[PDB]
């Protein structure tokens, strides 16, 4: 299951000033970048061109070029159309793309958010105000739908061009997509919010892809207070996940951090609290502690 999304952030500051930057993610790998700086889309990977010929891609870049330019001027007008209602600064976000499934099957989307809240979506052959959205949006919606010419080509991109690109991108980037990166791990500790309690931290960094399994163990028994963190991103498109455990001071011994990843095969990373290894690391990373939360 792969989710290909194109992200568009546009900042309207006043009647003159505006900015549009765009990024494109396949699953969770960046493939495309379009800065307001440059008049052309950029590839961030070698295989970002997809399975398309130089001219075949030109029609896209060119159409999109026409779009950026048009999009700005259209909202800039739509603002003028609502004389008192909706004044600057304006923030508009577009998340559009298609999800991938077993077989030829796919499902595309185009979601639009005005000032943070998601308010407009493209569906079938027309834009529509989401259920639970402000009614003033109706007049601008009515104005935009009259354009069969746009509403036509948007169906083209959603119904056809999206999956016919992404079925390409996947078959063209299987090499980078199925790469395996081994995680390094280290232990540490901080005081707990609670008096007399402490917090044990298991750091996991440099692994690819995402799906990983970190747990605090006393032998065969997983510790239920093992709280998984969030996935923090690394520069080189790997990942970072820490897993913390709260302990009664002087119950730190006997515990160990076990890491299960696709990268390693069967050989789990098992770090033992207070092993000659753990001590070697901890002495290798000592400091003054200002300023520590």
């Amino acid at each position: 299951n792969y989710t290909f999304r194109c992200l568009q952030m546009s900042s309207f500051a006043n009647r003159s000033w505006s900015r549009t930057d765009s990024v494109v993610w396949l699953g969770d790998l960046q493939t495309h970048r379009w800065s307001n700086d440059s008049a052309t889309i950029s590839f961030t990977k070698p295989w970002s061109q997809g399975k398309l010929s130089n001219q075949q891609w030109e029609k896209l870049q060119h159409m999109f070029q026409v779009y950026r330019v048009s999009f700005t001027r259209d909202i800039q007008e739509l603002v003028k159309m609502m004389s008192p209602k909706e004044d600057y600064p304006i923030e508009i976000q577009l998340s559009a793309g298609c999800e991938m499934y077993p077989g030829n099957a796919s499902e595309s989307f185009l979601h639009v958010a005005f000032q943070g809240k998601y308010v407009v979506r493209f569906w079938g052959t027309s834009w529509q105000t989401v259920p639970g959205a402000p009614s003033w949006l109706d007049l601008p919606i009515k104005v935009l739908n009259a354009d069969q010419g746009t509403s036509a080509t948007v169906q083209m991109l959603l119904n056809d061009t999206c999956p016919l690109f992404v079925r390409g991108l996947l078959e063209a980037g299987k090499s980078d997509l199925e790469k395996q990166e081994k995680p390094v791990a280290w232990l540490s500790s901080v005081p707990s919010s609670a008096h007399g309690h402490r917090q044990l931290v298991c750091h996991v960094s440099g692994f690819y892809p995402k799906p990983v399994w970190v747990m605090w163990m006393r032998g065969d028994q997983e510790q239920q207070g093992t709280h998984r963190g969030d996935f923090l991103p690394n520069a080189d498109e790997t990942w970072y996940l820490q897993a913390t455990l709260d302990v009664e001071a002087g119950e730190e011994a006997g515990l160990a951090c076990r890491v299960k990843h696709s990268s390693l095969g069967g050989q789990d990373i098992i770090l033992y609290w207070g092993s000659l290894h753990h001590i070697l690391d901890a002495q290798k990373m000592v400091w003054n502690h200002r300023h520590h939360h």
Epitope: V69, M81, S83, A146, D147
Partner: T-cell receptor, first 106, second 113 residues
Framework: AVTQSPRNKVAVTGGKVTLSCNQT?????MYWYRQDTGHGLRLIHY???????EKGDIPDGYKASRPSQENFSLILELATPSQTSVYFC??????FGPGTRLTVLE | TQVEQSPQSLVVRQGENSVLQCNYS??????LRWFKQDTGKGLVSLTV?????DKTSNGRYSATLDKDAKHSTLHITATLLDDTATYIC?????????????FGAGTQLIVIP
């Protein structure tokens, strides 16, 4: 169609000049243009609906006012010689007025 | 200057064919419309061109559009005296409300009897 008036006027540098524009065709947005030899029409001011106006390509020296949906007006507070043109009031797919000949003199 | 017309002025003989050219550089090109302006009078629509390769006819008027060469021609088939007028070519960048029209300087057509 579009019923603009006066169909013809002359005024001196500095006089107040207003150009009425009427239409029963029922169009939301409507426009003020001006024609000069070897140029083709140029947008001055333009409206989207009642009680609302916006600046076009060449808005300097002029103003606009929308009271009704049916009416429109292009306003010269201080007139100038260089504002000697013909004035067309469009309505919109876009249907145009018969034109107004304004010679502004020294 | 977005939309240039050739020739400047043109002269044809009563009841003979005449060709008119419009050559834009407007993006986007939703549509191109041709207008006939009698002297003193306003602008009357003649016909509208929409598709990438389009071709229409109306009375003796018959025009064709190539959106990929951003170029149009307007033909009059056997010109009348009632035809001496200026022929303005306009291009519309959007097919909605939020679009503006680009006007040519027009061609002056003179039909000699």
């Amino acid at each position: 169609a579009v019923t603009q008036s006066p169909r013809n006027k002359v005024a001196v540098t500095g006089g107040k000049v207003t150009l009425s524009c009427n239409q029963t065709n029922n169009h939301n947005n409507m426009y003020w243009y001006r024609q000069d030899t070897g140029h083709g029409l140029r947008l001055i001011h333009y409206s989207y609906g009642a009680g609302s106006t916006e600046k076009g390509d060449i808005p300097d020296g002029y103003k606009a006012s929308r009271p009704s949906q049916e009416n429109f007006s292009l306003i010269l507070e201080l007139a100038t010689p260089s504002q000697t043109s013909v004035y067309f009031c469009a309505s919109g797919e876009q249907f145009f007025g018969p034109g107004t000949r304004l010679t502004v003199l020294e | 200057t977005q939309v240039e017309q050739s020739p400047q002025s043109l002269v044809v003989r009563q009841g003979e064919n005449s060709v008119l050219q419009c050559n834009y550089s407007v993006t986007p090109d939703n549509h191109l419309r041709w207008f006939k302006q009698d002297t003193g009078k306003g602008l009357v629509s003649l016909t509208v061109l929409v598709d990438q390769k389009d071709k229409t006819s109306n009375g003796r008027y018959s025009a064709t559009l190539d959106k990929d060469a951003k170029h149009s021609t307007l033909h009059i088939t056997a010109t009348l005296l009632d035809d001496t007028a200026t022929y303005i070519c306009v291009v519309g960048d959007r097919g909605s409300a939020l679009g503006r029209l680009h006007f040519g300087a027009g061609t002056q057509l003179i039909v000699i009897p």
